[PDB]
Structure 1
Amino acid sequence: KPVVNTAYGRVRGVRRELNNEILGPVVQFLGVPYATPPLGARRFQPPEAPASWPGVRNATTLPPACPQNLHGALPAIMLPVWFTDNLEAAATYVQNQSEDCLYLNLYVPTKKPVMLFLHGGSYMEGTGNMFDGSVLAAYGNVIVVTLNYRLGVLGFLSTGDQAAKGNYGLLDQIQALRWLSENIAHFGGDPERITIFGSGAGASCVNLLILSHHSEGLFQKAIAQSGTAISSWSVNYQPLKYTRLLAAKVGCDREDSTEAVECLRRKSSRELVDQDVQPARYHIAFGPVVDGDVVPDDPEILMQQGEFLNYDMLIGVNQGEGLKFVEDSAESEDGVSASAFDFTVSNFVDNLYGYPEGKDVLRETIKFMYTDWADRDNGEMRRKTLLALFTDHQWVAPAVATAKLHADYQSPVYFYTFYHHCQAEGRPEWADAAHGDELPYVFGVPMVGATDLFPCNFSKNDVMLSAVVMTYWTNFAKTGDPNQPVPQDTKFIHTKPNRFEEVVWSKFNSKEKQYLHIGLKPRVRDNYRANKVAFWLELVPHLHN
């Protein structure tokens, strides 16, 4: 239980032996502060330095979660599938929760790299306590850092201008990054190799922070897993509409904008969060905002403007992310009918577009792009294309658009496609890697049993691939190149053909656009979902005017 010198005082940890031989000992520094508790006047405002404690600290204990309501106001399309599948177990990590939750975890193995994991799923739920970064830290020989940041209703509320600028949850994350860039050295890690990695909403932040001038020499490498800043549910373009309703429900609905927020300074957080103010399908009620400050402009304008540092990037998507989209089709058998098809695709255009000629054309033309024709009477293979309609539109299209944009400014990008998943009954046979199914592998869960969340029988291959992705990820934190240093050796556990042995993960550039197909039989292919992307990226634009 060692103590360590930080610029605000000293903290205690816990050495804990892993039951696995390949995994070493780790020191866990759970629940260290990075910003003074944002209560009262410190609410709805940017975080600063934390308390300076004169003595020591007992940081051997998990911090509380941020004010959130898991039962009700469910944005179930957005969330990682393992979340909604096991809401039961999910609620466990968010019981002890206070408005004081600006806290940081550190998983240290004993000038190492640092991997800051930005959790989430909707901007509104979640906690860093969810993901035990012990196994990642101990296998990759890297410092893994989970965190907590204010959540949506309380962390992302905004008025049309000044009274509430918004994005307090994002600022909470760069103040956990200001703390890392000054103090991680003392834990045994190089502060010039901090990498920020996230999935879903978490990845939307990774990608936003890149574009934010509020973080420059704070991190130098980024990993976006299944999420971007140009996605439909990325940034809140309607923050006034949803702030009004929230204020209207508690009684803080003043005509004056700046007096309404001062009312909101007074009402209890337990009450302030649990309101049931929900967004329009596929959008966010509370999240990131174009404020002209932390996020200077629309992420898309910002990207082409190209005023961001050339971070080392690792972007990717899963095969069938949008499982949730074709959920009402669990008891179908005949799959989805054309009647059900024409319907679903119609109010997909409705919910994401709405303007004339497109209204009729765009809807009919994309229908054509997602029917097979070679076999068009088959419901079960209409189901798949419906799933990939969403998947393509929400994750694939935006990721390749992103990877392409940064690669053009000579920021090195490595594109991954995750095609493998654990079965986990209560699941279709056609499932094949839904949104957020990559996490258990990135966090080496298949090594240390099956946790509360991911319960399924991890076969010896699930264990193998878990390592494979870990060495890839962790390599990237060091070099900014997943291939090196540690070669793809898996014969530590099973001397069976380590199937990623001699495959080289080539850089993803613009013209040629190579990616890594992560799965059972891995490859480097050249153009992922080539024409279905180009559809959304090139053609669909012209079908508005």
Structure 2
Amino acid sequence: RFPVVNTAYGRVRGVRRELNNEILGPVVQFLGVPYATPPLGARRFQPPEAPASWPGVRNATTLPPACPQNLHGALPAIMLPVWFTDNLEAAATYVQNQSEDCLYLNLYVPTSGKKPVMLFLHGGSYMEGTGNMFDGSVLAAYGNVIVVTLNYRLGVLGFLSTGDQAAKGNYGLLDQIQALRWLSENIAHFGGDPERITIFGSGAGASCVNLLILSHHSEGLFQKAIAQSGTAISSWSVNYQPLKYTRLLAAKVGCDREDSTEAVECLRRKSSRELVDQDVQPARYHIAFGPVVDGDVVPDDPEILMQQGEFLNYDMLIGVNQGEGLKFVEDSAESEDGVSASAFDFTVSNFVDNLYGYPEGKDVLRETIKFMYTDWADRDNGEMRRKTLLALFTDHQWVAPAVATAKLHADYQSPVYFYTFYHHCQAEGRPEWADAAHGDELPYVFGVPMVGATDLFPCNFSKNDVMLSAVVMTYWTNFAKTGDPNQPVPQDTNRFEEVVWSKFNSKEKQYLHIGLKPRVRDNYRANKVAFWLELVPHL
């Protein structure tokens, strides 16, 4: 049918699309309901407002337009998910209707009371992506939960700031908070539960989730959180010099005033497409436009705030993949042997210069992190140097910040569940030596194996992948239901039945090792994590 549900601002008409598979029940999709006023003119570069009531019934059947972006331009290719960089054309297929009016969200209701809600905060980086790429319909049909995927302002229109009061910034975070408010005060009509709202995202979008924890704006909106392959303390999570890039963009676009307010007004006079297409290149392993520490949404740097217990006890599910810096070694990934020492030292030196660059001492730090990240039992392998470089990038950017934030969240008696992903979808262009890369868990979480390969994921999915996906969404939906991945639904079609996930205590850093052969392990890369967290600050 075409079910109609009345919201607090009007009435919307959904659909009743039935899934390709058999065991999955029908799913009702309200694709394209709005949650804020479209920031088109003077409301641009301002926090969003509540929507406007409409008379009658509004169609919700087609995917809403995406926010303005430039996929075929100059984007940070090191932080984007691998499946998004590989399938760039199939990704740009979705972002074709780009327009400044994009603040719409899609809900996937399924067909033990009110169903929990799971918001998905997408975004490999802050300059690209849209919510229509992830068909959260298999997940809703499996876990009996309501998946909500939103669209928020990205790039210049959502994160431009000057530090002053003329342009505070963090308009994307405010859009996400407005969407959370809309879900909190409207999901009861759809059968959802406004008291069991989880937020889960991958990549830098997960960073938003973390940045949505240290903000007093989102106090009672959501109860849990699932941050996978993302943190608020990595190098590319927040922007610390927003004026240096805002002035650069203003100068390149045509008007660079010395007054913040008039420059902001001049930018507001520009079109939404002219300033998106403009190329502003940030420093390596950083971001140009992103969340900015101002005092309203992000009171201070996320490292300081989360150390002194500035959060309100959200159940948390953190995790990382095994090797995520697959694009760190990409200039030397198509050779018979790996990286020669003359190039390994060059890459490590460039790494140190770009990230640390501390003038106090660098001839000591470079040597010690060269010595640590090499296996002396097989020193002259060459081929197994790409592995150590990949491990270096994965450990510094993803594993260490994730472990640090898990320890900090678990030091204030808030539940933390740590996971590590090893299995990956067997693609065509993915190298055999490489392992599960950045964002290589999204197909499994969303039920792509149980619905068949799509344009974004062209891999051949066997029965092993189907079982792993079923187990992964079982864990995620159990966490959404109660906050413990083991209690609601016992594991069923295997080595997944007898493994019990345990919390992440700081003293005993227990975690679960999701993969072909699961196990509740005791410490993940304790040597390198301790190196990056406890030794490098002393050098």
TM-score, length basis structure 2: 0.98
1:65 lines up with 2:61 in the alignment:
no
Q: Deviations along 1:259-290, whole A, 9 cap, x unmatched?
A: 10000110001111110101111100000000
Separation (CA, whole Å) in 2 of partners of 1:213 and 1:297: 12
Aligned counterparts of 1:206 and 1:427: Cα–Cα separation in 2: 29
**Within 5 A, what are the aligned runs for 1:518-529?**
518-529=514-525
Paired residue secondary structure (2:201): strand
For 2:117 and 2:336, the matched residues in 1 are separated by 48
The Cα offsets for residues 418-460 of structure 1, whole Å up to 9 and x where unpaired, read as 0000110111111110000010000010010101100110011
Whole-angstrom CA distance in 1 between matches of 2:340 and 2:63: 49
**2:75 and 2:127 in contact (8 A); partners too:** no
Q: Distance in 1 between matches of 2:296 and 2:32?
A: 30
Aligned equivalent of 1:515, options 511, 517, 522: 511
Aligned residues of 2:250 and 2:256 also touching (Cα < 8 A): yes
Aligned-residue offset at 1:19: 2.3
> What SS class does the counterpart of residue 313 from structure 1 fall into?
strand
Give the whole-Å Cα distance in 2 for the aligned partners of 1:275 and 1:357: 36
Deviations 1:235-271 (A, max 9, x none): 0011111101110111121011111000011000111
- In structure 2, the residue matched to 1:367 is 370
How large is the RMSD of aligned CA atoms in angstroms? 0.8
Distance 1:40 1:422 in 2: 44
1:446 equivalenced with 2:449 (yes/no): yes
| % identity of equivalent residues | 100
SS at 1:185's partner residue?
coil
For the residues of structure 2 that align with 1:382 and 1:70, how far apart are their CA atoms? Answer: 32
Deviation larger for 149-158 or 299-308? 299-308
Three-state SS of the structure 1 residue aligned to 2:369 is helix
Shift, 1:305, TM fit: 2.0
Aligned length: 534
Relative distance call for 1:332 and 1:357 in structure 2 (3 A) is farther
The answer to whether 1:503 aligns with 2:504 is no
Deviation at 1:333, TM superposition (A): 1.4
Of 77-86 and 330-339, more deviation after overlay is shown by: 330-339
Secondary structure (helix, strand or coil) at the match of 1:193 reads strand
Question: Offset at 1:88?
Answer: 1.1
What per-residue deviation string (whole Å, max 9, x for no partner) do you get for residues 345-400 of structure 1? 10100001112353111111000110100111011111101001000000000000
Corresponding residue for 2:89?
88
Does the 8 Å contact 2:103/2:153 carry over to 1?
A: yes
Q: Distance in 2 between matches of 1:8 and 1:487?
A: 40
Using the alignment, how far apart are the partners of 1:236 and 1:218 within structure 2?
25
Query: What whole-Å deviation, never above 9, does each CA across 1:60-119 have from its counterpart, x for those lacking one?
Result: 111000000000112100000001101010100100111000011000001000000000
Q: Distance in 1 between matches of 2:50 and 2:255?
A: 30
Q: Hey, what's the Cα distance between the residues in 1 that align with 2:359 and 2:284?
A: 21
Tell me the equivalent position of 1:164.
167
| 1:14-65 per-position Cα deviation (integer Å, ceiling 9, x unaligned) | 0011121221000000000000000111100100101110211101111000
Please point out which of 190, 193, 201 is paired with 1:190: 193
Q: 1:244 aligns with which of 233, 243, 247?
A: 247
Unpaired runs of at least 5, structure 1: 490-497
Alignment-derived partner of residue 206 in structure 2: 203
Matched, 1:278 2:274: no
Q: Is the 8 A contact 2:155 2:290 kept in 1?
A: yes
2:446–2:473 contact (8 Å) kept in structure 1: yes
- Corresponding position of 1:338: 341
Aligned to 1:533: 529
1:255 aligns with 2:251: no
CA distance in 2, matches of 1:164, 1:219: 27
4+ residue runs over 3 A deviation = none
Match of 2:28, SS state, is strand
Shift of 1:125: 0.1
**Counterpart-to-counterpart distance in 2, 1:349 and 1:216:** 39
CA–CA separation in structure 2 for the residues paired with 1:76 and 1:354: 22
What CA distance in whole angstroms lies between the structure 2 residues aligned with 1:403 and 1:211? 14
Partner residue of 1:33?
34
Residue 37 of structure 2 aligns to a residue in which SS?
coil
**Cα deviation 1:103-155 (Å, max 9, x = unaligned):** 11000001000000000011110000010001110011100000000002110
Instruction: Please say if 1:130 is aligned against 2:133.
Output: yes
1:422 equivalent in alignment to 2:425: yes
After the TM superposition, which of the residue ranges 355-364 and 330-339 deviates more from structure 2?
Answer: 355-364
Inter-partner Cα distance in structure 1 for 2:333 and 2:350: 20
Whole-Å separation in 1 of the counterparts to 2:163 and 2:207: 22
CA distance in 1 between partners of 2:507 and 2:84 (Å): 37
What secondary structure does 1:214 align onto? Answer: coil
Asked whether the 8 Å contact 2:424–2:441 carries over to 1, the reply is: yes
Task: Check conservation: 2:31, 2:62, Cα contact below 8 A.
Answer: yes
Cα deviations across residues 441-500 of structure 1 (Å, max 9, x unaligned)? Answer: 0001001010110011001101110001000001000111111210111xxxxxxxx221
1:299, distance to aligned residue in structure 2 (A): 0.3
For 1:375-390, what aligned pairs fall within 5 Å after superposition?
Answer: 375-390=378-393
Q: Once structures 1 and 2 are overlaid, which stretch shifts more, 41-50 or 15-24? A: 15-24
> Shift in Å at residue 161 of structure 1?
1.3
For normalisation by structure 1, the TM-score amounts to 0.97
Cα separation, 2, equivalents of 1:451 and 1:412: 35
